[PDB]
Design a protein around this ligand. Structure first.
Ligand SMILES: [Cl-]
Ligand SMILES: [Zn+2]
Ligand SMILES: [Zn+2]
Ligand SMILES: [Zn+2]
Length: 121
DNA sequence: TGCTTCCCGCGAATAACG
DNA sequence: CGTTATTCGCGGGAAGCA
């Protein structure tokens, strides 16, 4: 089909026929396989570009709107994405958002229409 | 070398099904 | 509808890049 299976120990892995990348979940391999396949297009509704993954388009479109959903809770600065936010918190506040504390807040997306997680309210 | 985008397990929201 | 299958948002490390 589009993959074969591998089994080590009990573990089942799904392997991409084309690039031989390994996946624990089949939904993952299918999501990945569109990169080879290009059977689904995710075109940017603001410009030319097309993406092989829905989430790539979504990150892209937020950069069009300028919305800043990531807010540092120590000083209030807002950021476009996780990486800027984390980078800020680590350098300025000398803390890590990975472990434990709610150091930042992610606002619901309001600059465009995407699926909304009830926990962000 | 520090931004920048990619990656993929995980599971919530929604769609397709019956 | 209830009940499933599907989509895709998210974290945060990795990989890419100039
Ligand atoms: Cl904003
Ligand atoms: Zn592949
Ligand atoms: Zn665009
Ligand atoms: Zn701050």
């Amino acid at each position: 089909d589009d993959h074969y299976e591998l089994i080590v120990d009990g573990r089942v892995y799904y392997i991409c026929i084309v690039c031989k990348r390994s996946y624990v979940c089949l939904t993952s391999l299918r999501r990945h396989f569109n990169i080879h396949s290009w059977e689904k297009k995710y075109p940017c509704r603001y410009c030319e570009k097309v993406f092989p993954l829905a989430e790539y388009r979504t990150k892209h479109e937020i950069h069009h709107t300028g919305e800043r959903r990531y807010q540092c809770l120590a000083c209030g600065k807002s950021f476009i994405n996780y990486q800027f936010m984390s980078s800020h918190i680590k350098s300025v506040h000398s803390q890590d958002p990975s472990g434990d504390s709610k150091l930042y807040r992610l606002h619901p997306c309001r600059s465009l229409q995407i699926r909304q997680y009830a926990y962000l309210s």
